[PDB]
Amino acid sequence: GILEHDPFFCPPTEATDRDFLTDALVTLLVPLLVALLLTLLLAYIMCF
């Protein structure tokens, strides 16, 4: 009682969303650290 085999119907699996937290943390920490270093530099040679 089998008509076709069609080994191509592969539904997408239970693919959860990719974790954006790590990359967002990286691309938010890099400019945050840059801005903090900039503020330190501004204090250093603006107040001396």
> Which residues make up the interface to another protein (CB under 8 A)?
1-6, 8-9, 11-15
19 binding ligand NAG? (CB under 6 A): no
> Which amino acid, residue 44?
Y
Quick count: other Cβ atoms within 10 Å of Cβ 43? 10
Q: Which tokens go with 4?
A: 């076709």
In the complex, what is the shortest distance from the CB of residue 40 to another protein, in angstroms, rounded to a whole number? 43
Task: Give the one residue of 4, 6, 14, 19 binding ligand NAG; rule: CB under 6 A.
Answer: 14
In the complex, what is the shortest distance from the CB of residue 5 to another protein, in angstroms, rounded to a whole number? 8
